[PDB]
Amino acid sequence: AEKLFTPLKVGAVTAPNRVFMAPLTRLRSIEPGDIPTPLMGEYYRQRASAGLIISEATQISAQAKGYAGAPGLHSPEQIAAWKKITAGVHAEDGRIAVQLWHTGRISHSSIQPGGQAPVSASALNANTRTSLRDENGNAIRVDTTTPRALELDEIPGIVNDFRQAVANAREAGFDLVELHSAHGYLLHQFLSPSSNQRTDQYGGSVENRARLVLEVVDAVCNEWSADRIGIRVSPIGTFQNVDNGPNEEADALYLIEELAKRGIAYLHMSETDLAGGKPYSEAFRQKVRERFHGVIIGAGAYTAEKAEDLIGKGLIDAVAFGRDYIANPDLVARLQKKAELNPQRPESFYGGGAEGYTDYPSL
Ligand SMILES: Cc1cc2nc3c(=O)[nH]c(=O)nc-3n(C[C@H](O)[C@H](O)[C@H](O)COP(=O)(O)O)c2cc1C
Numbered sequence: 001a002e003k004l005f006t007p008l009k010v011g012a013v014t015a016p017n018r019v020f021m022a023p024l025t026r027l028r029s030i031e032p033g034d035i036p037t038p039l040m041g042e043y044y045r046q047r048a049s050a051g052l053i054i055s056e057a058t059q060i061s062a063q064a065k066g067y068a069g070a071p072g073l074h075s076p077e078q079i080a081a082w083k084k085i086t087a088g089v090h091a092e093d094g095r096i097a098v099q100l101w102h103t104g105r106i107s108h109s110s111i112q113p114g115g116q117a118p119v120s121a122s123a124l125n126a127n128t129r130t131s132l133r134d135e136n137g138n139a140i141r142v143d144t145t146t147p148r149a150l151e152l153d154e155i156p157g158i159v160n161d162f163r164q165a166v167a168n169a170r171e172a173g174f175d176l177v178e179l180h181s182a183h184g185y186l187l188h189q190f191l192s193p194s195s196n197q198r199t200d201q202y203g204g205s206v207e208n209r210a211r212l213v214l215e216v217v218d219a220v221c222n223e224w225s226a227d228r229i230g231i232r233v234s235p236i237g238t239f240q241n242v243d244n245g246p247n248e249e250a251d252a253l254y255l256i257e258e259l260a261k262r263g264i265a266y267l268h269m270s271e272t273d274l275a276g277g278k279p280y281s282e283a284f285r286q287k288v289r290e291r292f293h294g295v296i297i298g299a300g301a302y303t304a305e306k307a308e309d310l311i312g313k314g315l316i317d318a319v320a321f322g323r324d325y326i327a328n329p330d331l332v333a334r335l336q337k338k339a340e341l342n343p344q345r346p347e348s349f350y351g352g353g354a355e356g357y358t359d360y361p362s363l
């Protein structure tokens, strides 16, 4: 029997199905101000039949910015714009979480406050690219700037920025928040020994490496409620040159046991980047499942059939689809009916306007 189209309690909200829209950076916000737009509102409204929409990654602060065109949730103007977007999703009977990030070293000095180097756990270049805008406003890929290591006394400010962004998110009408602790961004930069060479209380042992993300979790649970908080992790494998170190499984299980103590709404596991990699072992999935007592969302080149299999095995609760949600606003109906999926147009994933954004048809 199919379970994808059955309801699921996700902390404080109830999803009517298990087909979630993964967080998808689309880089269509207004500059100056990193302001969401009515076009973005239309895009999200089109996808409101998702069991849960998880927004594009959204800055907690101006310092958090690493991509031209990515929205923020730190300014009054951003709060006002997001309020209209969440109202539109709710008018269509949807549910929407905001994914909150700090990009850390995956950034460029030209888009940082004061034109300064971005920050990270350690002063190590990401050795990758980010997306800026050229003089005509078009997306361009540019090598990342070498970061400055955060001073110990700057850490409380980072925690406060997450806390403040969650206050703002609650005000803006989001149903949940997802902390971006994956994919080589700031929280993951602290988690991974490959990017964290600190020798203070925020590096070294796994307890120290997870310290920042757990302080953030505690701060945001206190600001709102634990049943409003999810977290995305990518703790097995390599993502944007950030591996998970030489004890990745044990370190992941430590973090997950710690997260379970807070009673948070969900754990969202990004299992692979677009280039793929070794699948999660069923033993690992079992170890995660016995340790965490909230919703588990799986993501990364899923099919509906794989999601059904893992839901049936009692190992995950929901699936997040990324690219299929870019191209199929009514992905839920298509998967329910076994309809074909619209052809994807990758050239318009990042930047631009309505074309390749709001022009993918429903059935
Ligand atoms: C254009 C694009 C933007 C993405 N932006 C984000 C993001 O903002 N936050 C995030 O955690 N993952 C991001 N991802 C990863 C997706 O959430 C998803 O995990 C990935 O695309 C693999 O799932 P899929 O095979 O269903 O597309 C992005 C992926 C794509 C293709």
Ligand SMILES: O=[N+]([O-])/C=C/c1ccccc1O
Residues within 6 Å of the ligand: 025, 057, 182, 183, 239, 270, 272, 273, 274
């Ligand atoms: O893992 N991915 O295939 C993409 C990740 C991603 C892409 C753009 C912005 C934030 C992200 O986490």
